[PDB]
Tab-separated table of C-alpha atoms in Angstrom:
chain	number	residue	atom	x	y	z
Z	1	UNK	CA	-38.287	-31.378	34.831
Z	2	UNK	CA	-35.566	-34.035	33.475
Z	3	UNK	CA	-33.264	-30.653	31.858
Z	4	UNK	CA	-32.387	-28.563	35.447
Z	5	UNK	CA	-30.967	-25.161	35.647
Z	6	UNK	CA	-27.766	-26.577	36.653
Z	7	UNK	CA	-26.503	-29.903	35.108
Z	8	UNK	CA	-23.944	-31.651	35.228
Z	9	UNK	CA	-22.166	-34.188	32.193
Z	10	UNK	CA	-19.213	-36.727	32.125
Z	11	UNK	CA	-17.991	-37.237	28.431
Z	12	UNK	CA	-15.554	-40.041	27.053
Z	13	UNK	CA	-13.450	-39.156	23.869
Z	14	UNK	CA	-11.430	-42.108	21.910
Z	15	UNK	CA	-9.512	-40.370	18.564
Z	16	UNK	CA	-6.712	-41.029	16.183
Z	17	UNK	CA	-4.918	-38.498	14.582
Z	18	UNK	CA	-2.426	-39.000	11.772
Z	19	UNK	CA	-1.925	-42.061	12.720
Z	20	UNK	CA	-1.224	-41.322	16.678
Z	21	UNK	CA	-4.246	-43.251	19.035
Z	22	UNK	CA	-5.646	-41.878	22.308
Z	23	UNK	CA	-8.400	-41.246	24.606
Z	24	UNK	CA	-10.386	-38.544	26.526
Z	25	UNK	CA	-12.640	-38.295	29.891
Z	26	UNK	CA	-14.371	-35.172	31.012
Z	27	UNK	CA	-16.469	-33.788	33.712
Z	28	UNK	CA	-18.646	-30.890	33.116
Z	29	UNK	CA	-21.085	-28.316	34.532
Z	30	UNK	CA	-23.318	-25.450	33.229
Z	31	UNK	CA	-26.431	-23.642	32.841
Z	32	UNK	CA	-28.700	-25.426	29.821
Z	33	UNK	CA	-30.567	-22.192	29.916
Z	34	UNK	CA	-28.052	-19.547	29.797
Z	35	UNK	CA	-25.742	-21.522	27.652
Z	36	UNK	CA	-23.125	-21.433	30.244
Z	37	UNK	CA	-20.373	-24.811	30.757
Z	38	UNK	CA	-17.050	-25.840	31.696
Z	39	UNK	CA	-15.210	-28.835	31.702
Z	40	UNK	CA	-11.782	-30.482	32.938
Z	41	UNK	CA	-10.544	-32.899	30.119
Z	42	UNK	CA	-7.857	-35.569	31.200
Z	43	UNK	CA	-6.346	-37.616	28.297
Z	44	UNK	CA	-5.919	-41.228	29.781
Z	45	UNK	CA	-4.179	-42.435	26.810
Z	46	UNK	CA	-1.961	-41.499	24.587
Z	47	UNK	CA	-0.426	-38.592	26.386
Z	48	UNK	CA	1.248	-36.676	25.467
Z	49	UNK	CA	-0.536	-35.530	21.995
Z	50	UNK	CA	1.516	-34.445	19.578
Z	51	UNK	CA	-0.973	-32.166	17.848
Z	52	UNK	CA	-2.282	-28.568	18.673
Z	53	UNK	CA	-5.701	-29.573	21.232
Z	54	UNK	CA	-7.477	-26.920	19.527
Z	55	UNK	CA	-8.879	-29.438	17.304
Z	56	UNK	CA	-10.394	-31.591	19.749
Z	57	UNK	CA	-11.700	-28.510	21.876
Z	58	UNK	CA	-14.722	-27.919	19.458
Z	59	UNK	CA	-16.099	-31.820	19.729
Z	60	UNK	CA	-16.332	-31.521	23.770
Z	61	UNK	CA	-22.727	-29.735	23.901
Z	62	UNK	CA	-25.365	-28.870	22.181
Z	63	UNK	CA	-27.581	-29.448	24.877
Z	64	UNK	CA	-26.346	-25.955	26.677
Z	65	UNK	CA	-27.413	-23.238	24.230
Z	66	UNK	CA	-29.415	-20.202	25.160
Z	67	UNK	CA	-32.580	-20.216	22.918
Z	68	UNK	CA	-34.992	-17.682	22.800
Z	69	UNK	CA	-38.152	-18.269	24.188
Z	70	UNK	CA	-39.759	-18.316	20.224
Z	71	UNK	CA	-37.297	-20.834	18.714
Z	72	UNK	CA	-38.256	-24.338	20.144
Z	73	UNK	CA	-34.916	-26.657	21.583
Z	74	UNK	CA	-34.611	-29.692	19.412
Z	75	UNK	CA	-32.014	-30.427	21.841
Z	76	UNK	CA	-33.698	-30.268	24.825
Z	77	UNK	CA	-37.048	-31.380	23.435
Z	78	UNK	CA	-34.576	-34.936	22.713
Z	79	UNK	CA	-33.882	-35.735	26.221
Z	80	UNK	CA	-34.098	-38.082	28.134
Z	81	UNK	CA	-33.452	-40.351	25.182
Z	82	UNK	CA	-31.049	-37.887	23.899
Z	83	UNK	CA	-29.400	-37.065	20.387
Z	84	UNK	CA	-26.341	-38.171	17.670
Z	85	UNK	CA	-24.447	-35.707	15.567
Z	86	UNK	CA	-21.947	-36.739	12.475
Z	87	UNK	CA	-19.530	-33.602	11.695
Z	88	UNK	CA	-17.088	-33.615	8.770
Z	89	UNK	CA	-14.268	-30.299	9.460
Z	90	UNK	CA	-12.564	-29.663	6.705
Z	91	UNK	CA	-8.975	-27.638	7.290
Z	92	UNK	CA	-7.517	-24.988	4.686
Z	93	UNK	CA	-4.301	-27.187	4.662
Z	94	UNK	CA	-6.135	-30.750	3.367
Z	95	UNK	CA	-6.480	-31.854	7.365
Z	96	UNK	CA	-9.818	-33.690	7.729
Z	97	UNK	CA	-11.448	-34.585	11.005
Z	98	UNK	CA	-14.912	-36.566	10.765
Z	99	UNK	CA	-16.500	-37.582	13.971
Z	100	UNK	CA	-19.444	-39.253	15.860
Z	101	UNK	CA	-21.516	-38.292	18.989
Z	102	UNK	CA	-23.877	-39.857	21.187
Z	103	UNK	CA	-25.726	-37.448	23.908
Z	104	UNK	CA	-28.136	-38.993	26.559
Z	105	UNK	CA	-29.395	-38.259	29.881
Z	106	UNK	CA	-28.882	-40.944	33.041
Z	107	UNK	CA	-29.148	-40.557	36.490
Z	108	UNK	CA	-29.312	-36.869	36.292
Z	109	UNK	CA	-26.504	-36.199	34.189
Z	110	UNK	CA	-25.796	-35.851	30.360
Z	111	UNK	CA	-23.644	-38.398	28.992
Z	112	UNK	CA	-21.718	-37.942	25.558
Z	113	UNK	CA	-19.487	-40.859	23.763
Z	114	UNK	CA	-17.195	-39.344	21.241
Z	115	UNK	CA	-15.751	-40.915	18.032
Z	116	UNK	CA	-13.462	-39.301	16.064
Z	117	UNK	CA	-10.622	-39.622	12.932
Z	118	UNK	CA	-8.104	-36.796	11.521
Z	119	UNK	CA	-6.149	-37.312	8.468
Z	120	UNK	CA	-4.246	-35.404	6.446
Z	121	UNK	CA	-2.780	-32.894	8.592
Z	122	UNK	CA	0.748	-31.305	7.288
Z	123	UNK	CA	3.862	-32.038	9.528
Z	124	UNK	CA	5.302	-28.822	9.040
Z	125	UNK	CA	1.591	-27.686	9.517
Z	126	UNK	CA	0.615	-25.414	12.349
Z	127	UNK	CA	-1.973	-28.349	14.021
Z	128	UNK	CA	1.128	-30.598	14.066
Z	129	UNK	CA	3.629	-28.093	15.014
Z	130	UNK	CA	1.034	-26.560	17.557
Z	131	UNK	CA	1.210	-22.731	16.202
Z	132	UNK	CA	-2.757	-22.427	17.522
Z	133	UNK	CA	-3.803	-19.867	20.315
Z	134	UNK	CA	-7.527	-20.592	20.639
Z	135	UNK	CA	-10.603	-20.199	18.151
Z	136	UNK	CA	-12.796	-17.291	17.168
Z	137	UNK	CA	-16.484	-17.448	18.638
Z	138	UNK	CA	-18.469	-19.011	15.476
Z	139	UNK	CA	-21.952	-18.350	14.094
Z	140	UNK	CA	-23.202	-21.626	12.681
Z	141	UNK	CA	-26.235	-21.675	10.477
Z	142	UNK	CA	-28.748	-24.244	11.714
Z	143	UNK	CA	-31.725	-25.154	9.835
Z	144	UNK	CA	-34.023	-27.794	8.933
Z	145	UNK	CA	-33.799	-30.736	6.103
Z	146	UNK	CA	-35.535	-34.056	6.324
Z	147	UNK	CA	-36.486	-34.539	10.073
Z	148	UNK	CA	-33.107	-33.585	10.857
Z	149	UNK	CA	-31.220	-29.984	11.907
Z	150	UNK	CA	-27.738	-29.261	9.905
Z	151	UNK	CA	-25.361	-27.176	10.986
Z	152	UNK	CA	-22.455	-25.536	8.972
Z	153	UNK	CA	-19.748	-23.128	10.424
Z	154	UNK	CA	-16.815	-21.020	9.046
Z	155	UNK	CA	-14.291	-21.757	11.822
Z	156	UNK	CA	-11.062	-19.943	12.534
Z	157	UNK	CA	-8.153	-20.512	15.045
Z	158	UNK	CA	-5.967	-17.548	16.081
Z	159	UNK	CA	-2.150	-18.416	14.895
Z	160	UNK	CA	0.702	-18.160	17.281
Z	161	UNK	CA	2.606	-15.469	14.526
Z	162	UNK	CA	-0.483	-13.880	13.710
Z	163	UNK	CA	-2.535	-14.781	11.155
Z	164	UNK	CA	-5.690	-17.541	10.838
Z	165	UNK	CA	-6.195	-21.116	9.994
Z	166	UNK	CA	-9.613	-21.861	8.466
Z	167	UNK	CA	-12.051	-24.806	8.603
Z	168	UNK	CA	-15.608	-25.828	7.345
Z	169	UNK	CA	-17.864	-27.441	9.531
Z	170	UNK	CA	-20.743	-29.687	8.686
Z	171	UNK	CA	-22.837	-31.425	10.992
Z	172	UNK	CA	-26.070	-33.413	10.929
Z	173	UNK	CA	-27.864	-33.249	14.481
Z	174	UNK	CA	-30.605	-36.182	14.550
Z	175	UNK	CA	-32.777	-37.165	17.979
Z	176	UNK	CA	-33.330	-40.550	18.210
Z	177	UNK	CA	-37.605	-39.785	18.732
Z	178	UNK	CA	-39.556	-37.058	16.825
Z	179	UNK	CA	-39.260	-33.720	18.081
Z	180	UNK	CA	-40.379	-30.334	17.036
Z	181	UNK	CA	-38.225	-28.789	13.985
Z	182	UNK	CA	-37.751	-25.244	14.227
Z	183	UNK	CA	-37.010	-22.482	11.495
Z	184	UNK	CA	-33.376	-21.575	10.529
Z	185	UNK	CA	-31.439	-20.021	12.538
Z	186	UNK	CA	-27.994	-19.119	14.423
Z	187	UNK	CA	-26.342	-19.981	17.013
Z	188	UNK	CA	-23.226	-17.960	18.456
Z	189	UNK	CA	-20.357	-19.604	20.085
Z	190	UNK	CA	-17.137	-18.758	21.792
Z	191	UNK	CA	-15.393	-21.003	23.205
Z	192	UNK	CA	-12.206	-20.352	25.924
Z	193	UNK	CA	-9.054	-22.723	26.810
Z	194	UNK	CA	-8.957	-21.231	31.060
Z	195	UNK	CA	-6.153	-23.568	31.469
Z	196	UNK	CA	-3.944	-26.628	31.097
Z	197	UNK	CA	-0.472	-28.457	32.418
Z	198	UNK	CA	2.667	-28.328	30.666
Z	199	UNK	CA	1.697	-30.869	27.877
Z	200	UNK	CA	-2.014	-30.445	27.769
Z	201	UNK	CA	-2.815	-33.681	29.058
Z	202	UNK	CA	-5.238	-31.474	31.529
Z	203	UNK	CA	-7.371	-28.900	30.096
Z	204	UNK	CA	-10.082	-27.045	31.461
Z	205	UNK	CA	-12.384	-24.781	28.868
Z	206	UNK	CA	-15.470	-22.429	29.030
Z	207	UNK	CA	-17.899	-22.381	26.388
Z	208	UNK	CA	-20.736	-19.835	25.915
Z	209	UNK	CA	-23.413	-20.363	23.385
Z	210	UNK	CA	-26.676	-17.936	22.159
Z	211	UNK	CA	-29.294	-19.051	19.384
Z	212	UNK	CA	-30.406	-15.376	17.654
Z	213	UNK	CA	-32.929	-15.195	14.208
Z	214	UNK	CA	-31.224	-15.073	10.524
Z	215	UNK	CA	-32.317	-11.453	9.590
């Protein structure tokens, strides 16, 4: 009743990177059932970046995955009250990024406060110089450990030569009541950059997600 076919989210971003301080606000749309969003990112502070916005793509929704009709929806099973998440990505080149989430649902829309650090990012690297076209679409292998869900992911961005840079993701989805644990499982994501200004201080991206069994 609460979780429509068509929703509707606003999401608030603050960040440092290496050092450089900024802030993010986003307004959102999709289908919580299909696993279907979009959203148009400003950053309000601290524009210009001067790292690749790849990184930051990936912690704008767990609330909009397709799940089949035999794996229950911790996340929508959390709602009204909502959810947290604490992720740790850990970069090939040393670059760390550890973050914090808050999802809840008022007034008809979903509502997410982000929190986030990155560290230890090269200056010749490709994040810094911003050598990134885009990521990969991702499998990450939820499952069950102490009331909780974790995730963990093998990420990988397309470089602007040709190659890959790599990252492991670790995250620790908790509602904030009790709610149904399912089984292990996957969930596929892709996730699409449709467009942005000059300097990326406007981005829009599309994000498709699908939970599927482990074998």
């Amino acid at each position: 009743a609460i979780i429509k076919e068509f929703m509707r989210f606003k999401v608030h971003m603050e960040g440092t990177v290496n050092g450089h301080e900024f802030e993010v606000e986003g307004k959102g749309e999709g289908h919580p059932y299909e696993g279907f969003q979009t959203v148009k990112l400003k950053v309000t502070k601290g524009g210009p970046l001067p790292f690749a916005w790849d990184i930051l793509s990936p912690l704008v929704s767990k609330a909009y995955v397709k799940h089949p009709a035999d794996i229950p929806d911790y996340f929508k099973l959390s709602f009204p009250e909502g959810f947290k998440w604490e992720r740790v990505m850990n970069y090939e080149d040393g670059g760390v990024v550890t973050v914090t989430q808050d999802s809840s649902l008022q007034d008809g829309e979903f509502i997410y406060k982000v929190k986030m650090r990155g560290t230890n990012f090269p200056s010749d690297g490709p994040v810094m110089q911003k050598k990134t076209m885009g990521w990969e679409a991702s499998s990450e292998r939820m499952y069950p450990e102490d009331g909780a869900l974790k995730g963990e992911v093998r990420m990988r961005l397309k470089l602007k030569d040709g190659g890959h840079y790599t990252s492991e993701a670790k995250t620790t989805y908790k509602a904030k009541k009790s709610v149904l644990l399912p089984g292990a499982y996957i969930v596929g994501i892709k996730l699409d950059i449709t467009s942005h200004n000059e300097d990326f201080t406007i981005v829009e991206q599309y994000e498709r997600s699908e939970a599927r069994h482990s074998t």
